C-alpha cells in the first residue's frame, strides 16, 4: 500500500480577497491546534501517510506552523504548506530549517501587474516569487498551484518562462471552479496559446502535472468548453480516494481526496467525522464508506476535480504506482 497524502486545512482566515474563493477576507478564529496535532500524528502513521499538507485559509497566518512542520518532520512525515507566499520570504528559512520538504505557492498570473490585482494583494507574486528561489536554494522542492480561466489563459505561456527560470520544479494548472457557467469567447485560441505549454521540452521547460486544465481528450475538451465540467480521473475509478485524506479542521470533516467530494443530493455534511466520541480516528468505517462512492461514481458525478488528481489517478490505473510528490 502506497505512502498517502493527509492534508489538514489548518484555518480559514486569509490575507487575500481573491475573486474565486470562500475565504477571501476570511478573519474566522479557528485555529487547528497543536494538541490536535500530536494526537493526529500517530493515526496519521499506523494509516500509512507519508506526506501532511497544510493548507485553509493562509497557513502562514497560523503561528504554530513552523513548529507544526518540526513535529511532522521528527515523526518522519514530509512536510508541505501551500500558501499565497506573501508572508513566505519572511518564513522560508524558519520554515526550511524546521524540515519543510516543499512548498507550493500560488500564481494565478504571469506578473505582479495581473496575479496581485486577482488577489487584490500588492506585492503578493513579488514575495512568492522570492520565496520560492530562497526555498529552491534552501533545498525544498518548489512548486506552484495555478488556478486558469478565461481571464488569464493567455498568461500561461509566460508564467511557464518565468518558473522555469525561477527554478520551479513541479507546476499544477488546473480549471477555475465556479458555481455558474464558465464559457470562452474561443476554445480554439485556449488551445493555440496554451498547447504548446503542454507540448514543451520538459527539460527545457516546466510541464504541468497530470492532465490539461481544459482535457486531454477531444470529448474531455467538448465537456470543459461547452458544459463546464473540468477533466477528472478517468476509466472506470479513481484511485485518488485511497491515497487521500483531507480534514476540515473547523468542521469535523474527513475527506477522500482534496476536491472534497460530495454527492449532488446530500445535504448533509461531506466527509465523514473526523473524530468518535471526541477520539481523532481515521479510516473509519463512515470514511471507507464515503471514499468507496467516490471510487466508482467519481469518474462519472465529480465536477470539480483538479489536474494534478485526474492524473495521480490515471497513472495508478495504468502503471499501477506514482513518483514520488505527483500529488
Ligand atoms: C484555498 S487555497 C489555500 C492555500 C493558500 N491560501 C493558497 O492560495 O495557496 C488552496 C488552493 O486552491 C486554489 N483555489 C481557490 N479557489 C479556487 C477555485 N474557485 N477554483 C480552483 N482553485 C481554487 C488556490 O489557488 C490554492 O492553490
Ligand atoms: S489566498 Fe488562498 S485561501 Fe486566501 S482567498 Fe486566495 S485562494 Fe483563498
Ligand atoms: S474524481 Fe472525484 S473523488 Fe476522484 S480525485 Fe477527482 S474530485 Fe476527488
Ligand atoms: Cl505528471
Given at each position: ?28 478564529t ?29 497557513p ?51 506578473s ?5 490585482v ?20 534552501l ?31 513541479q ?24 498547447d ?17 486544465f ?43 481526496c ?22 481523532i ?18 469518474p462519472?458525478?465529480?465536477?470539480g ?5 485526474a ?11 506514482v ?5
Open positions: 500500500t502506497r505512502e498517502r497524502y493527509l492534508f489538514i486545512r489548518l484555518l480559514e482566515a486569509c490575507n487575500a480577497d481573491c475573486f474565486m474563493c470562500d475565504f477571501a477576507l476570511s478573519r474566522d479557528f485555529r487547528f491546534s497543536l494538541e490536535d496535532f500530536d494526537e493526529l500524528l500517530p493515526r496519521a502513521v499506523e494509516a500509512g501517510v507519508g506526506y501532511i499538507r497544510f493548507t485553509g485559509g493562509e502562514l497566518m497560523h503561528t504554530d506552523v513552523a513548529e507544526l512542520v518540526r513535529r511532522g518532520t521528527d515523526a518522519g512525515m514530509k512536510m508541505s504548506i501551500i500558501t499565497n507566499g506573501m508572508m513566505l520570504p519572511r518564513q522560508i528559512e524558519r520554515l526550511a530549517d524546521a524540515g519543510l520538504a516543499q512548498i507550493i505557492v500560488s500564481l494565478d498570473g504571469g505582479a501587474a495581473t496575479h496581485d486577482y488577489r487584490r494583494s500588492p506585492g503578493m507574486f513579488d514575495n512568492g516569487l522570492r520565496g520560492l528561489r530562497a526555498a529552491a536554494r533545498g525544498v522542492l518548489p512548486r506552484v498551484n495555478s488556478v486558469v480561466g478565461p481571464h488569464n489563459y493567455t498568461e500561461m505561456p509566460q508564467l511557464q518562462r518565468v518558473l522555469t527560470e525561477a527554478g520551479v520544479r507546476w499544477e494548472l488546473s480549471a477555475l471552479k465556479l458555481e455558474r457557467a464558465i464559457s470562452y469567447p474561443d476554445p480554439d485560441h485556449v488551445r493555440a496559446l496554451c504548446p505549454v503542454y507540448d514543451a521540452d520538459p527539460e527545457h521547460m516546466l510541464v504541468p502535472l497530470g492532465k490539461r481544459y482535457g486531454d481528450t477531444p470529448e474531455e475538451q467538448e465537456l470543459y468548453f461547452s458544459d463546464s465540467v473540468t477533466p477528472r480521473a478517468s476509466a472506470p475509478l479513481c484511485h485518488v480516494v485511497d491515497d487521500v485524506i483531507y480534514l476540515d479542521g473547523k468542521y469535523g470533516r474527513a475527506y477522500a482534496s476536491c472534497l467530494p460530495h454527492r449532488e443530493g446530500d445535504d448533509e455534511p461531506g466527509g465523514a467525522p473526523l473524530r468518535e466520541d471526541g477520539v480516528r481515521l479510516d473509519t468505517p463512515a470514511f471507507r464508506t464515503h471514499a468507496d462512492f467516490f471510487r466508482t461514481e467519481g462519472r458525478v465529480c465536477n476535480c483538479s489536474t494534478t488528481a492524473g495521480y489517478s490515471d497513472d495508478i490505473a495504468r502503471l499501477g504506482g513518483r514520488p510528490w505527483q500529488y
